[PDB]
Amino acid sequence: SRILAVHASPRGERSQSRRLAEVFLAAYREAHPQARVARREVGRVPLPAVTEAFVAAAFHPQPEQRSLAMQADLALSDQLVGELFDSDLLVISTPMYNFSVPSGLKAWIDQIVRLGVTFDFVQYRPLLRGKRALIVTSRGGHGFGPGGENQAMNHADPWLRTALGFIGIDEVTVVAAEGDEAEQRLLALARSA
Amino acid sequence: SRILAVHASPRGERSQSRRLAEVFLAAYREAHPQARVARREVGRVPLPAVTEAFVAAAFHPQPEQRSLAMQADLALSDQLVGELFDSDLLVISTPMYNFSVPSGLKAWIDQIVRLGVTFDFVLDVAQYRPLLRGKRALIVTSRGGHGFGPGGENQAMNHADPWLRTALGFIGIDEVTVVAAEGSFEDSCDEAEQRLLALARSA
Ligand SMILES: Cc1cc2nc3c(=O)[nH]c(=O)nc-3n(C[C@H](O)[C@H](O)[C@H](O)COP(=O)(O)O)c2cc1C
Ligand SMILES: Cc1cc2nc3c(=O)[nH]c(=O)nc-3n(C[C@H](O)[C@H](O)[C@H](O)COP(=O)(O)O)c2cc1C
Ligand SMILES: CN(C)c1ccc(/N=N/c2ccccc2C(=O)O)cc1
Ligand SMILES: CN(C)c1ccc(/N=N/c2ccccc2C(=O)O)cc1
C-alpha cells in the first residue's frame, strides 16, 4: 500500500523502462486508490557517489558520536533509506547500460546499503523485512533473461537481486522488455499485488 | 607500452586497490623508464553519468551533423576514449562496492563505450563488433569479505570484476588479468603485491 518508485533512466518521455513502470503504477493506483506513491529520481538527476567522507561516517565504530559534519555527509543517505523503510513495495525501473545499470542506480544502492541500518554484521544479516520489489527493465538487445543466449552477460537485474537480497528484499519480480507483452504482464501484476 | 591507469576508489592513502596498483606502476616504471603513464581519476572525483543528451548525441544517426552543443555533450567522452586509444595497457584499480564497482567506474565505462568509436554494429537484429585492438587490461581489486573469486563460496554474487570483463570485452579488450585481495588480509595483500611485481617485470 506504500510504494517507492525508483526511476533510473536518464530519459524522460522516451524512456521505455519509465513508461512501463508508470503503467504499473497507474494500474496499481486504480486498484488501490488509497495507496501512496513516492518517486525517487536517480536517472534524470545526479546522485552523488560514495566518498571517503561517506565511508568514514557510515562505518564509524561509534555512530552515536558522529559529528554534525558527518551527519551532513550521511543526510541524503538517511533520506534515501527512510523512503525505503516507509515502503511496502519497491518499484525500480531501469535500462540495461553496458551489461549493468546506469551509474545513478548504482549510486542509489551505494547510499542505501548502510551498516546498522539496512544490514548488520556479527557474518552479515539483513535488516529490512516485509518488502517486495518489482524491477522493470528495458534492454536494447535480446537474450539476457533466464535461459537466454546472453544470460551470463546480465549484470543488471541479477546484480540488483543480490544487493536487494543483502538488505532483506528477497521477494523480487523482474519484468523485461528486449529487442506489448510486458505491459500486459504489468497490468496483471497490478491487479493482484 | 603506454599505460592508462584508472583509479576507482574514493579513498586515497587508505585505498588498498589504489596502493596495489601504484605498486605495479612504479615497478613497471623501474623496468621501462621511457614508458608513459597516464592517470584517470574516477573515484575521488565525480564523473558525469550518461544523460539523455549524451544518448541523443552518441547515437545520432548522422554524426557529422551534430551541433556544437551536441559535441560539447560528448567532449568528456572523447577525452576519455582518447586516453584509451592512446594506451596499450589499461590498469583499473577498484574496490567491490555492494557486489559491483563504485558508481564512478560505472560512469567511466558508460562514457567509453561509444558507437562508431569503440564498437560498431551491422544489421541482421544488430550484430556488434569491437573496435579496440592490441590492448590488455589489468584489474586490481580489493574486497572486504571473502569468497568472491573463482571457485569461491560467494562467486555468483560477484558483479564487479566479472562484469568489467564482459564490458571491456565488448569493446575489444579480451586479454584481462584480475589480481584480487580479499578479507591475514595483509597476507592476501602481500600475495597480490607479489603477483603484481611479477607481472610488471614481464609486460
Ligand atoms: C549507454 C547505453 C548503453 C546501453 N547498453 C546496452 C546493453 O548493454 N545491452 C542492451 O541490450 N541494450 C543496451 N542499451 C540499449 C538500452 O538498454 C535500451 O535503449 C533501453 O530500452 C533503454 O531504456 P530506456 O528506454 O528506459 O531509457 C544501451 C543504451 C545506452 C544509451
Ligand atoms: C560503500 C561500500 C560498499 C562495500 N561493499 C562491499 C561488498 O559488496 N563486498 C565486499 O566484499 N566488500 C565491500 N566493501 C568493502 C570494500 O570492498 C573494502 O573495504 C575494499 O578493500 C575497499 O577498497 P579500497 O581499499 O581500495 O578503498 C564495501 C565498502 C564500502 C565502503
Ligand atoms: C551494449 N549494447 C549491446 C548496446 C548499446 C546500445 C544500444 N542501443 N542503444 C540505443 C540508443 C538510442 C536509442 C535506442 C537504443 C536501443 O535500444 O538499441 C544497444 C545495445
Ligand atoms: C557488503 N559487504 C560484503 C561488505 C561491506 C563493507 C565492508 N567493509 N567495509 C569497510 C569500510 C571501511 C573500512 C574497511 C572496510 C573493510 O574492508 O571491511 C565489508 C563487507
Curated annotation (Swiss-Prot), chain A:
Binds 1 FMN per subunit. Gene3D superfamilies: 3.40.50.360. It comes from the Bacteria. FMN binds at residues 9, 15-17, 96-99, 138-141. It holds the Pfam family Flavodoxin_2. Its EC number is 1.6.5.-, 1.7.1.17. Coiled coil: none annotated. Belongs to the azoreductase type 1 family. Rate of quinone reduction is higher than reduction of azo substrates, suggesting the enzyme is better suited for carrying out quinone rather than azo reduction. Quinone reductase that provides resistance to thiol-specific stress caused by electrophilic quinones. Shows a preference for benzoquinones. Also exhibits azoreductase activity. Catalyzes the reductive cleavage of the azo bond in aromatic azo compounds to the corresponding amines. NADPH is the preferred electron donor for azoreductase activity, but it can also use NADH. Can reduce different classes of azo dyes, including the common azo dyes methyl red and p-aminoazobenzene sulfonamide (PAABSA). Can activate several azo pro-drugs used in the treatment of inflammatory bowel disease (IBD), including balsalazide, sulfasalazine and olsalazine. Homodimer. Homotetramer formed by a dimer of dimers when the ionic strength is high. This is FMN-dependent NAD(P)H:quinone oxidoreductase 1. The lineage of its organism: Bacteria, Pseudomonadati, Pseudomonadota, Gammaproteobacteria, Pseudomonadales. The gene is azoR1.
